[PDB]
Symmetry: D3
Subunit: 233 residues, 6 copies
């Protein structure tokens, strides 16, 4: 009766934090709460290094931190397909990849994300307009956020999003958590504690290997983010 | 050279969450960061049932969760003295109890709190005025908050806090993660997940004893908060 | 397939304005837009004089203004049942009266209101707690507003509303209005035009009978609102 | 004794809405209210197609809607001069034309506008600086807005406007209902009701001719707004 | 062109650059409409009978006001209200000054939005006093929160009805040197140089006028207006 | 207890009660920490080579600064910077004054508002090595009403955060925003600026009719010296 859903979260996870994990908890409670869906699985998909984002450390490490973070998760797992791509892959292709994989009574894959990601649809050249359309019309978004009217507004201001609003589920986050990866790296560079902001095993892995520093933050400096490069050219 | 410091936090811890542990980490980085102090220990002291606060579940439950929460901490521990007293004890007595206990070169106990508690100083009949003075003049306050200017202002607006401002340290939390006990109890009453908001051992203990509910929320309904009863009469 | 719905707006309509009529258009588009409902009728039900609200003019006139306002509406009508009650009737009973009437495959009546009304649920004694419960659980509320996180938040802070959140639909209204009856009456007493804020026929009816003045505003001065008097005593 | 005044509003009126008409009502109450003026007429002057604004439908439709909107008004009418010119006309010329036309103890024509228009004086190349000076110095400006202190600040920040401020009247709208033309088109594209947001005859005219759509919104896409083209090149 | 006399009542406990600033702002504004001509400014310190918490001796407040205006061509201090052994309503102070001028310029009350909004504080003003002040004299209300004052006026049928006699003067230079904050600064021994005129600063320092003790004067005592009007 | 000298660089166009208030606030703060003793305050107006739009002749600015502090027991004016032919970096001004004191030696600290601090992010306005040296070897006493604005600006910058022990954020609780810009605007419109600046500065401006639409246009279109030098 209810539609089975698989939550897919793409992102750089640089590094993964408690907020990324909360995203799944919140979305699951929300989708299951509607009485219309059954969340069967969650997937964390770290982006490959060809994404070229500034300060992005090696994919293998981000994949290991995510596995450590979901070690004790009964329903959330890590998928490495994206991390292994020599050519950065569009989110639309990742969704397609996962939907097809499930096909091989079939659960539907929905993109799990936050407000920022939804709003980035308006950054020039970051997304191919046709991609935005197929993502909302054929897959769906589960957008979690502390600024719900911020997202509702953004959806209202765009004809394509408004038209497919039935597939964009905005999930309010009442507990104010804004544990960004960027503030974690900043904390690490300064020798500050990040305990209780990221799983214990992740924090331990990061400190053991000094993964984050001024130097790592410099990776890809002056380089153009893959999507931008490819959509402008 | 450096003044050694023991950070003490009184509160209901109903229940303890990642945020209370996070307060300790933050306060310690800040105090050690000044170069003028060395934080040798943190103490979590749950309030005894005589506090009579609404929704306050039994102290043994709150103490065990706080103990489970700090089990894997190397410097934060729980002290049960206050929870075991038959009569509710003023924060100043708790600070004094602990300061004396250390005398037996001697570390200074300092109160660790959020802006809310600092602000509660103005609540009529909540604090004896000589208490506030002794606390800030003889012990000290380490006030952690996301609303820095709020606290700075509160201090600026009181002749006494301002006079002793050198003994009051406002610590800014740039990684906003406000996991209140109230929001946790609300989530629990609603069957929502609190995974990653509190230590796994705390969650497991909450689950096993089905701790928070509409009925628990009702405890002490209509009773008058202990310090209010005492200071009024 | 789709659930048929009848929207019922209770209120003083003192006087009815363009925003009251907008409520129906918005709600209808929203409900039919979900693809899960079919709005078959709108009902404006002006409150009887026994409600005793300060400044409330005779019900006969409020009913006439509502009739004139919906003269050209194909689906929104006026029901006088409430206006004729010698004893003020609780909204729950009005809802019940209309649902029973429909039972003579049966459409469901839902209360159409704005966020102000939803929030009035917290005014001490204004609403019987069990009434609120039965309204959200057995009928439903379609709440329109320019402050949706206003309403969303109000629902999140109440266990009973949250529990029945599936029966409460928040409809964002992006075209920022704010045309309260109270400001229309203030305008009239000041001899200001209210054309284009209310239907032409309503404006003309008001002008012809000098309905609103300082005298009309004093009606019921010093009298307690019916629900308050009945729930307190 | 009292200076007679003719309020003139230039604009695209694409489409006209209840808000554009309320604007005249408010300004009239204000100007007459001061005891120093007598408003004898209001003129809506739709901009011609040569303005080249994106999404601007043909002037005949906009003029007709505007006439339908004012058919039932006793003092506000539509003037077509501006729209009949082959070349887009500077607002100052439109004002001059009308002042001259009245000289055929003579009423003063004053520009009637919202805050948006006022603030557009800062847009690079949108207005020749001598035009601004002449408009405010020789005719006058009646600025109706819900952001009164906003308009006041904009005037304070400009030497030109401040110097002639006695000829600028900021009228506060306390009964806000910002029904922008942009939001009306947005609603039309989406099949949403606009009943009670525009005069019934406008609404019916739009509906009979299916006026707004994705296609109309594209008109002049990529074409440079006439004033910009003129004052730049 | 109507001649206007700006009358400012209040504690001036102590007078600050902001109070003086009020006159300059109002003058430029009224004179700027072309419909008026400001001829004089009168600072009138309230008498000690007002009984407001922290109010120091009128002798000092009068003296500081005089020092503040010593070099003022058009603003002066009127010690009448101060020498009143019985606290006088603002209306009566306006009358006193109107009647004094006829022995003809119109006296208008100069003030801030606080004072205007205080019309809503229970029993602080006799409603007929409000009506007569706005109706028969006029308010020149200076403020940084202009919409604060406009909304307050819009919300009251009485003030609205007399809106033409209530001139709201915006002040765009965000400065709010309240007396309260000057006292606070002095109790804590911080400098207030450049927030009040040099002579008032020097006067205050030389006599250690403000303190925890001076702040406690009249503690627990009801405000004159509140007493008279409630009983 | 470390002896300190507060040095304020800026256009001072014109100086107002607020710039003066800035010194009083910082000195009270610094002395109140019980770790410092503020011995002197120096106001140093930028030279005309700054080329900032609306910047009137440096000589007038210096004189108003002198009149403003004529009665100041501890704050004085220094024309060295205004007399240089080429616009001088703040780092060089600080250095020049620290070297002048060396002739138990007092430390010169830059006194500024949040704007200047935040200006560190303006592209090409400051050499990054210059920022590091100013904060590491001299220090910043930043006065402001938006304390969290500044605290946050510091928190977001690794170099500033790193040297935060040398950056003191002093909260101004008595809002006192008398910007030079608003003073010039008021004067152009003939409004009174009495009690916004010291009486003597006010009298001087009046006597010389200093600010006008015309002066406000000085250097119109000219690129600010730092931006010019750092882009080339
Ligand atoms: N297909 C395309 O054209 C395209 C353009 S960008 C893009 C993908 O978008 C991603 C960008 O990742 P990133 O590093 O910028 C983001 P990051 O990895 O930090 O975020 C992962 C997810 O968590 C969300 N999130 C983060 N913090 C919060 C919070 N505090 N509250 C609620 N939600 C939160 C983010 O919006 C995101 O959806 C990449 O995976 C990239 O491949 N696809
Ligand atoms: N001595 C007295 O007169 C007196 C009056 S009240 C009082 C004591 O004060 C306590 C009040 O406890 P409670 O249950 O209300 C508080 P709770 O137990 O929730 O808080 C514990 C501590 O965390 C702080 N804190 C909480 N959330 C945050 C946050 N999100 N960010 C930063 N800091 C935060 C609080 O200020 C407090 O210091 C009691 O234990 C009581 O004994 N003493
Ligand atoms: N059953 C009870 O215990 C109970 C308590 S009060 C109550 C009923 O509640 C009603 C209160 O009526 P009233 O005069 O206070 C309200 P009014 O008649 O002014 O409003 C009618 C409806 O329009 C809504 N509304 C008005 N303006 C807007 C706007 N600008 N934007 C969005 N929505 C708007 C209001 O929320 C309301 O739902 C009465 O009918 C009363 O009988 N029932
Ligand atoms: N002369 C020039 O150099 C010059 C440059 S632009 C210009 C003219 O200015 C015009 C602007 O056209 P447009 O498309 O923006 C007209 P639009 O139809 O959008 O607006 C008409 C008027 O209503 C006002 N208004 C709108 N909404 C509100 C509201 N919600 N509350 C209060 N007031 C409101 C607007 O500011 C405007 O004055 C054009 O007609 C153009 O010819 N003249
Ligand atoms: N007649 C009555 O019923 C009545 C009630 S209160 C009253 C009189 O009202 C006065 C209240 O004096 P007080 O001590 O409370 C006020 P204070 O003396 O501090 O203020 C004097 C004036 O300056 C204004 N002002 C203050 N700060 C600002 C600012 N930052 N910006 C712009 N304007 C500002 C105030 O509103 C006031 O008009 C007294 O003189 C009292 O006699 N009369
Ligand atoms: N060295 C470099 O690379 C570099 C780039 S810009 C620069 C210097 O920075 C200066 C900029 O001067 P300017 O004319 O832009 C600023 P202005 O002269 O107006 O300011 C003087 C001082 O007052 C502070 N201040 C201003 N308003 C307030 C307020 N309201 N509250 C608290 N404090 C305040 C300012 O930050 C500044 O430190 C110049 O002297 C210039 O030489 N150095």
């Amino acid at each position: 009766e209810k539609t089975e859903v698989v939550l897919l979260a793409c992102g750089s996870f640089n590094p993964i934090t408690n907020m990324h994990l909360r995203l799944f908890e919140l979305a699951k409670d929300y989708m299951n709460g509607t009485g219309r869906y059954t969340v069967v699985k969650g997937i964390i998909s770290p982006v490959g290094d060809a994404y070229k984002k500034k300060g992005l450390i090696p994919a293998y490490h981000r994949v290991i931190m995510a596995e450590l973070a979901t070690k004790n998760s009964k329903w959330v797992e890590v998928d490495t397909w994206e991390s292994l791509q020599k050519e950065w892959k569009e989110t639309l292709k990742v969704l397609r990849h996962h939907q097809e994989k499930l096909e091989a009574a079939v659960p539907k894959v929905k993109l799990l994300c936050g407000a920022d990601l939804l709003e980035s649809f308006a950054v020039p050249n970051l997304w191919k307009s046709e991609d935005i359309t197929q993502i909302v019309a054929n897959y769906g978004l589960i957008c979690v956020t502390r600024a719900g009217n911020d997202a509702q507004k953004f959806i209202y201001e765009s004809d394509v999003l408004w038209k497919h609003r039935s597939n964009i589920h905005v999930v309010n986050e009442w507990i104010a958590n804004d544990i960004s990866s960027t503030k974690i790296r900043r904390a690490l560079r300064r020798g500050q504690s990040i305990r209780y902001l990221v799983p214990d095993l992740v924090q331990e892995y990061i400190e053991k290997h000094n993964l984050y520093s001024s130097e790592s933050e410099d990776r890809n400096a002056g380089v153009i983010l893959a999507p931008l490069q490819r959509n402008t050219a």
